[PDB]
């Protein structure tokens, strides 16, 4: 019967929650209170990247930690030389309402997608000189919200449809599709071993997926509204969430609990972009009150406020080297921030 | 300073010249967003305008009196309008289309309009209503078989407002219902609206050719009122 089926479901959920809370003697706060809190970190804008006509929704550093790519509502991708603020390429898009972008690890490709349910792959190292589209991925049914290359021939997408898919650019098929969510999947992040990834799906629930097998290996439920951002710790055994309830939370793929709740009564609007630092000690989060509040991963406080934008920040990424950090906002400006000593 | 300073200058400033060339085009075209239900003319209206000037957005562009408009019909999307309506702020106006023939599928149409109007990211976006399928309403309520008061009992003690504009050769016993369904939406709009954005109802039926002109005039009014509120005179 349906009622009995829902019964066992409920008791399985209870067996999930009690087992999860069984192994929860301590919190990061207890183990980090004795640890020395980090000082008040103070970044400063070291150069500004003017040129976008309208709002900015995405950015992503290259693997050289010097090139950059960013997406805008006017429908352009711009590749900056972040050292000299030079412009390398200006790629006009077919659809203006792009919502994400990604830069291939080899540096040969960039990807972008948006409200049109298409993921576009661009070729940067063309023998003919210009930048051309190399592939279109049209299997999705909802709007596309994030893209992440695995290599030159494998990309993973997350759409407004309650689905994540694994593509292969050579053929354009949908080798593996990931289902189980119930809301719009918003963010995405690859583990630093190219074997698992996570996705927040507008239902306060995040999941861990297996790029090879295909089934949802693990699911977390600790928020209370739409989950807007997600990112792996540099370890590969953790990930932080940012949601519309103005709270960030840190999970762990082998603990099945949220660890720290990143709350502040002064902060009232929801998170929009989350990224970590190379050491994993500085959790940087974009917000909607026009600042990029910088939190400490372990000590659960605010050790820095990167407020230099006029409109709402929307994207936030760090270099693979770790020497800088960039922020894009709805003011059409992209600022690379760095410290000074 | 090196001979490879062409990348430093003679490439980046050519790109910048192209970008500032495109900026003039961008900040000269008004973007419009079209919303509606499945049983309405939101497909017919857009194609009719297009005729004479698993995909996602169905782009549509047209101009009236040397002013360019980019209307974005949103296509194959899920039922929720929650998290992709944020991208459509700072457009000139939202074009909401309602079916008037149905009455069963009207209460949730008002609910959807209320949801759009009270959205947090659209508090500065004026809405343009097209109470479409009105020829069907005219030919239907004349052969009276479904009573409006069954779904809306307040229609009973309703009086046609003095500022009515009935078309020539029109039964006055359709106009009360017309303005009833209109001012239901209007009273939903006025409540909790502090002048930053207004509601602009219109009466199109199926094939009114003067829809581009209506959108043009409404956009002019929207811009004029926005400035007159900035230029504190209104």
């Amino acid at each position: 019967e349906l009622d009995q089926l829902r019964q066992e479901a409920e008791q399985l959920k209870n067996q999930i929650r009690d087992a999860r809370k069984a192994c929860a003697d301590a919190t990061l706060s207890q183990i980090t209170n004795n640890i020395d809190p980090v000082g008040r970190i103070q970044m400063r804008t070291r150069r500004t990247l003017r040129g976008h006509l309208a709002k900015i929704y995405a950015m992503h550093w290259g693997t050289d930690s010097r090139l950059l790519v960013s997406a805008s509502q006017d429908g352009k991708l711009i590749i900056w030389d972040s050292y000299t603020t030079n412009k390398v390429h200006a790629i006009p898009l077919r659809s203006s309402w792009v919502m994400t972008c990604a830069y291939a690890p080899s540096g040969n490709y960039v990807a972008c997608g948006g409200l049109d349910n298409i993921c576009s792959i661009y070729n940067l190292k063309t023998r003919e000189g210009n930048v051309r589209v190399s592939r279109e991925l049209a299997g999705h049914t909802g709007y596309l919200s994030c893209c992440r290359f695995l290599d030159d021939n494998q990309i993973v997408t997350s759409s407004g449809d309650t689905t994540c898919a694994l593509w292969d650019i050579e053929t354009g098929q949908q080798t593996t599709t990931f289902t189980g969510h119930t809301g719009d999947v918003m963010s995405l992040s690859l583990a630093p071993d190219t074997r698992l990834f996570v996705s927040g799906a507008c239902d306060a629930s995040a999941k861990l997926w297996d790029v090879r097998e295909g089934m949802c290996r693990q699911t977390f439920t600790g928020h209370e509204s739409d989950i807007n951002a997600i990112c792996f710790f540099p370890n590969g055994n953790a990930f932080a969430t940012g949601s519309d309830d103005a709270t960030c939370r840190l999970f762990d793929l082998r603990a099945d609990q949220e660890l720290m709740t990143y709350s502040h009564d002064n902060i009232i609007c929801g998170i929009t972009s989350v990224s970590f630092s190379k050491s994993g000690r500085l959790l940087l989060a974009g917000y909607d009150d026009f600042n990029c509040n910088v939190w400490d991963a372990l000590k659960a406080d605010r050790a820095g406020v990167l407020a230099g934008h006029d409109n709402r920040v929307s994207c936030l990424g760090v270099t693979d080297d770790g020497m800088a950090v960039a922020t894009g906002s709805w003011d059409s400006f992209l600022k690379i921030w760095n410290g000074s000593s | 300073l090196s001979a490879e300073d062409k990348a430093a200058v003679e490439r980046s400033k050519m790109i910048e010249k192209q970008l500032q060339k495109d900026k003039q085009v961008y900040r000269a075209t008004h973007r419009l967003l079209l919303l509606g239900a499945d049983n309405s003319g939101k497909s017919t209206i857009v194609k009719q305008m297009r005729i004479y000037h698993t995909s996602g957005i169905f782009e549509t562009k047209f101009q009236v009196d040397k002013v360019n408009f980019h209307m974005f019909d949103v296509g194959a999307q899920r039922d929720e309008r929650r998290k992709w309506i944020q991208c459509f702020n700072d457009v000139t106006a939202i074009i909401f289309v309602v079916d008037s023939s149905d009455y069963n599928r009207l209460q949730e149409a008002l609910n959807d309009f209320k949801s759009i109007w009270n959205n947090r990211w659209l508090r500065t976006i004026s809405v343009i209503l097209f109470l479409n399928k009105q020829d069907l309403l005219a030919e239907k309520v004349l052969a009276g078989k479904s009573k409006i008061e069954d779904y809306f009992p307040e229609f009973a003690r309703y009086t046609t407002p003095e500022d009515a504009t009935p078309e020539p050769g029109e039964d006055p016993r359709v106009t009360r219902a017309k303005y009833f369904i209109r001012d239901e939406f209007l009273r939903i709009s006025t409540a909790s609206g502090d002048g930053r954005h207004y509601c602009y109802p219109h009466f199109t039926c199926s094939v009114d050719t003067e829809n581009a002109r209506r959108i043009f005039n409404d956009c002019r009014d929207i811009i004029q009122r926005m400035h007159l509120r900035q230029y504190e005179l209104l």
Partner: single-chain antibody, 230 residues
Framework: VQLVESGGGLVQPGGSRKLSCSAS????????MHWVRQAPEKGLEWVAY????????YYADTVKGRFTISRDDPKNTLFLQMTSLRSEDTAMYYC??????????????WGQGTTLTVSDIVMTQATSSVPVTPGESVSISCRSS???????????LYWFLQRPGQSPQLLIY???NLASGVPDRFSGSGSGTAFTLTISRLEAEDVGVYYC?????????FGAGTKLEL
């Protein structure tokens, strides 16, 4: 990607000619354009340069007055106007594309070049000829005058191989970066004033003459050349 030249031929001294480069198969308007000449048995010598958008134009100090360069993007053709040909202008003029951005490979593609007959940094290539057989390794030397290593980190030394009956072809740009269609046998190195090119295993398609270019300033000079024989 294909450049073909025209406008060459015998010239009575005191006349003038209008050399042209006709590009095809690439975004010509995004590429800078050079001209390089070569005496019938000497090394190469830079001629002129015009940038993308015609904003920047240089010339060789030898003939900076008589010559004049010009491009025309819509027809994807490049022009060289030259007047009052001196006695020494007998050479094999080449047309070279070069796009400059972070990570690009300037001088990557060389045209087939045209012929003509009329009736301060320098590099010295120590060796003139090296006998060789297939199989072993070869290191070709080339020294300079100033230090090519710039502050930003680049070095601006180039390595083009020209086969006995073919056009020059880039091997290693900026002293360490290998080109697109070149096998990974080749490798470059050097001090910063004296440089060397290294080849692991020779084949039948590695003989010819090797040339080393500097690009630190505008007069991109050449070495005399090293020619390998079997």
């Amino acid at each position: 990607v294909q450049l073909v030249e025209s406008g060459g031929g015998l010239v009575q001294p005191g006349g003038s000619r209008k050399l042209s480069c006709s590009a095809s198969g690439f975004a010509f308007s995004s590429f800078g354009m050079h001209w390089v000449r070569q005496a019938p048995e000497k090394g190469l010598e830079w001629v002129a340069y015009i940038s993308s958008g015609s904003g920047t134009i240089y010339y060789a100090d030898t003939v900076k007055g008589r010559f004049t360069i010009s491009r025309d993007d819509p027809k994807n053709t490049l022009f060289l106007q030259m007047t009052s040909l001196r006695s020494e202008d007998t050479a094999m003029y080449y047309c070279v594309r070069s796009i400059y951005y972070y990570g690009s490979s300037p001088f990557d593609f060389w045209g087939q070049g045209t012929t003509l007959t009329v009736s301060d940094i320098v590099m010295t290539q120590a060796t003139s000829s090296v006998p060789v057989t297939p199989g072993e390794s070869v290191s070709i030397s080339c020294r300079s005058s100033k230090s090519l290593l710039h502050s930003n980190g680049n070095t601006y030394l180039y390595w083009f191989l020209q086969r006995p009956g073919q056009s020059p072809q880039l091997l290693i740009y900026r002293m360490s970066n290998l080109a697109s269609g070149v096998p990974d046998r080749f490798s470059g190195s050097g001090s910063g004033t004296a440089f060397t090119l290294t080849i692991s295993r020779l084949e039948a398609e590695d003989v010819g003459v090797y040339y080393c270019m500097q690009h630190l300033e505008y007069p991109l000079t050449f070495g005399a050349g090293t020619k390998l024989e079997l």
